[PDB]
C-alpha cells in the first residue's frame, strides 16, 4: 500500500504525542496527496484535524490508498525511541500490520498490529505567536479551570479569574504577540483551560497560530507543522 | 503606593523560592530606599532578613510607603511563569491587591489578594565561596542530620558524623574556598543540616558568603543578591 | 595500604552506578597493577568482572596489597557528590575504614566502614557500537521481557516479540553499527531484557562492545572504560 519516510523522528513523535494527549484512538487516511486524520476527544469537546501533505516527507510512495487505525498511546511510546536526527519510515504491506522503522546508526523495525477504529460563523479572527498563547494558557491554569477570550476592534484579551486571584493578558496589535486581528462585532467566549493546555503543547515560539471564535461559540485553533502540515483544533465553549 | 520593576523574572522567582523553603508567610516593607522583609521559620530556628535596595531594580517608584503581606508559596508559583529574560513588574494601588506583571513577548498581569501577616557576640568570622558551603552541607546531609562548625586561628572545619560514616571539610585560608578568616578564640558549634540545606540553595559558585558564629551560639549567614541585595540568615544552634 | 587518585569523579560514579544496578555487595582486590572486582547479581544470572589498571589513574600508590568489601549502594551516593572536573581520592590506612575524598574547589573527605563480603565455547563473536546495542535493548524492552540474539555468516540480528507487537534489528557488517563479525555456525540464543537493560547503561555512542555467545549458551559482553579499564559481563541465557 505505501512507504512513507519522515526526517526527524523526534519531531514526529512530539506531533503524535500532542494528539495523544487529547485522543487515544484514531484512523489515518493515507492517500497519494498526504496523510489526514480526524478524531474526537473522549469528552467530545475537541475535534482534531491533522493534515500531513507529501511535501513534508522525504519520500512519499503510496501504491494503493488505505485507511488505517492505530493506538496513539502505543504508537507514541515507539516513536519516542527516535532521536532528533533519526529517520522514520512508515511501511504498510502486511494487510493488518504497520511497520515502524527508526533509522539512525542502525535500522530498527517495529511491527504493530492495526486496530479497528470508528471514523461556523466566526465573528473574530486573530493571529498570535505560539509563545504568547502557550504562556497565557499556563497563566490561566494557575488561577482557574476556565479562560475567557475577548476580541474587540483593535485588541485581543485573554482573561481568567478564580476564587481569590486573577490573570489578564491584553494584546493590541501594536504588540509583538499579535500579528493580525479581524473583528466584526465584539466577541466574548469562555473555554476549558485543561483542554487548551493539551492543544497548546508542542507549540514553538515562532509558530503563527490563527484563532477563530464567536459569542458563546466554539473556537478554531490552527497552526502549521513544518509550514505545510496543518493542525486544526475545534474546541467547544465552556458550559 | 508603588511601581517596582525587576529585570530577570526567573532570578527573582528563585529568590522568593529560596525564602519559601523556610517561610510561608511574610510581610514586605516597601519604602523609598528599597524592599525589606523580616520573617521567621515555623520551627522558630531561622530568622530571615532580606534587603532589596532600589539599585537592583530597573525602575523604582514609591508614591507612598506601605507594608504588604503575601503568601510566598502563592507568590512563588506565579513568579515561576517568568523566564530569564522576562521583565517583572510589581504594582500596588488597589489598596488590598498586588499586581504581578510578567512582561516578555506579551504582557501578562496577575492580580493577587494581600493577606494580614503578624510582623550576638560572634567569636569567629569566615568568608567562603558559595560552592564550597553548598557542597559541604549536601555532603553532611548524606551522613547526618547534624553538622558541626569549627573555626581555629588559620583553619575552618565543617564536620559531620552519623551512626556508621563520617564526612569532613577542612579549609585553611590558602585554599580557594576560604577567602577570609577572623577568629578570636577556638569556636565550636553544631547546626541542623535540614535547615542549612534550604538556606544554601540558590547560591552561585562565585558568591561570597560571610559566616559568623560562636560557641554554643547561633550562626549568621550572609551573602548578596546581585551585589547589592542583602540576604541574611540567623540560624539557632542544634539542641 | 594504598592511595589511589582518579580524575573525573562523576565518570567513576557512573561506573559504580552501573555496577550497582546489578550488584549490591562486592569485594575490590587492590594490587600493584590495578583494581579488580568479581561479583554476581542476586539472581545469579550475571557475572560482573571489572578491571581497573593503574594506567587509568592519575596517581596509583599501593604500599601493601589488600582486598576490601564495600556497599556499592552506599558508595554510589557519595561518589555522586562529585562533579565532572572533580578529583577523586581513594585512601585506605585505618585497617577497616575507606577514605573517599572529593577534591575540587575544596577538599571533602568521607569516611566509610568496610564490610565483610564473601568472594565457554562461543560460536559467534560480534563487535558492535555501544549506541546500537543500547537502542536495541530499549526497543526490545517495549515489546517483550525477552530478546533473541541471532548471528549468521555475515549478519547479526537482535529480535524480540511479545503478545501483540514485535521489533527487529538487523546488522550486516556493511552497516555503521557492526564493526566485526566472526561466526562459525549459525547461532541463536535468548536473554532477559531487564538484565541487558542494566548492563547496557553508561555505554557511550562511540564505545566498541564485543559480544560472544552460543546456542542455548550464556553471552559475554565486554567493553572498555577509558580504553584501558575492562568491564566484562557474563549473562546466562533465558530459561
Interface test with A, best of B87, B106, B111, B113 (most A CBs within 10 A): B106
Give the integer Cα–Cα distance in Å for C19 and A192.
49
Residue A63 phi, psi (nearest 5): -65, -50
Q: What is the 3-state secondary structure (H, E, C) of chain B?
A: CEEEEEECHHHHHHHHHHHHCCCCEEEEEECCCEEEEEEECCCCCEEEEEEEEHHHCCEEEECCCEEEEEEHHHHHHHHCCCCCCCEEEEEECCCCEEEEEEECCCEEEEEEECCCCCCCCCCEEEEEEHHHHHHHHHHHHHHCCEEEEEECCCCEEEEEECCCCEEEEEECCCCCCEEEEEECCCEEEEEEHHHHHHHCCCCCCCCEEEEEECCCCCEEEEEEECCCEEEEEEECCCC
Q: Does C85 touch chain B (CB under 8 A)?
A: no
Q: Does B112 touch chain A (CB under 8 A)?
A: yes
Nearest CA in chain B to A133: B106
Find out whether A82 and A9 touch, Cβ atoms under 8 Å.
yes
Nearest CB among B132, B138, B166 relative to C105 is that of: B132
Nearest CA in chain C to A112: C165
Flag if B109 and A168 touch (Cβ within 8 Å). yes
Q: What is the 3-state secondary structure (H, E, C) of C180-207?
A: EEEECCCEEEEEEHHHHHHHCCCCCCCC
Find out whether A199 and A233 touch, Cβ atoms under 8 Å.
yes
Give the integer Cα–Cα distance in Å for A164 and A143.
8
Cell output for A85 = 536526527
Q: Does A107 touch chain C (CB under 8 A)?
A: yes
Give the method used: X-ray
Q: Does B75 touch chain C (CB under 8 A)?
A: no
Find out whether C72 and C89 touch, Cβ atoms under 8 Å.
no
Flag if B143 and C110 touch (Cβ within 8 Å). yes
Find out whether C9 and C102 touch, Cβ atoms under 8 Å.
yes
Contacts of B106 in chain A (CB under 8 A): 129, 132, 135-136, 169, 171, 175-177
SS3 state at C218 = coil
**Helices A9-20 and A72-79 meet at what angle, rounded to 10?**
150
Contacts of B170 in chain C (CB under 8 A): 107, 109
Q: In this structure, what DSSP letter does residue C140 have? A: H
Give the integer Cα–Cα distance in Å for A27 and A37.
6
Cell output for C125 = 563473536
Give the integer Cα–Cα distance in Å for B185 and B187.
6
A59-62: strand order across its sheet: A59-62, A2-7, A87-92, A97-103, A107-113, C166-171, C156-161, C146-151, C187-192
Nearest CB among B78, B81, B109 relative to A135 is that of: B81
Interface test with A, best of C142, C155, C204, C205 (most A CBs within 10 A): C142
Domains (ranges, CATH) in chain C?
Answer: 1-239 (3.70.10.10)
Q: Using CB atoms, which chains have 3+ pairs under 8 A with B?
A: A, C
Which resolution, in Å, applies to this structure?
2.5
DSSP assignments along A4-67, one per residue: EEEE-HHHHHHHHHHHHTT-SEEEEEE-SSEEEEEEE-TTS-EEEEEEEEGGGSSEEEESS-EE
Amino acid at each position: 500500500p505505501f512507504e512513507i519516510v519522515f526526517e526527524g523522528a523526534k519531531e514526529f513523535a512530539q506531533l503524535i504525542d500532542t494528539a495523544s494527549k487529547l485522543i487515544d484512538e484514531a484512523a489515518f487516511k493515507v492517500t497519494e496527496d498526504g496523510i489526514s486524520m480526524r478524531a474526537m476527544d473522549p469528552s467530545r469537546v475537541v475535534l482534531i484535524d491533522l493534515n500531513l501533505p507529501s511535501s513534508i516527507f522525504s519520500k512519499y510512495e503510496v501504491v494503493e490508498p488505505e485507511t488505517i487505525g492505530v493506538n496513539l498511546d502505543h504508537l507514541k511510546k515507539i516513536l519516542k525511541r527516535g532521536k532528533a536526527k533519526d529517520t522514520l519510515i512508515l511501511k504498510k504491506g502486511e494487510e493488518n500490520f504497520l511497520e515502524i522503522t527508526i533509522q539512525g546508526t542502525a535500522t530498527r523495525t517495529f511491527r504493530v498490529p492495526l486496530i479497528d477504529v470508528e471514523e461556523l460563523p466566526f465573528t473574530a479572527k486573530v493571529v498570535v505567536l505560539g509563545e504568547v498563547l502557550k504562556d497565557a494558557v499556563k497563566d490561566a491554569s494557575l488561577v482557574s479551570d476556565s479562560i475567557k477570550f475577548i476580541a474587540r476592534e483593535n485588541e485581543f484579551i485573554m482573561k481568567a479569574e478564580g476564587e481569590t486571584q486573577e490573570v489578564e493578558i491584553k494584546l493590541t496589535l501594536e504588540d509583538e504577540g499579535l500579528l493580525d486581528i479581524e473583528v466584526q462585532e465584539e466577541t466574548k467566549s469562555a473555554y476549558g483551560v485543561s483542554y487548551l493546555s493539551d492543544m497548546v503543547k508542542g507549540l514553538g515560539k515562532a509558530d503563527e497560530v490563527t484563532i477563530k471564535f464567536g459569542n458563546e461559540m466554539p473556537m478554531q485553533m490552527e497552526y502549521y507543522i513544518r509550514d505545510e502540515g496543518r493542525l486544526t483544533f475545534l474546541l467547544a465553549p465552556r458550559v
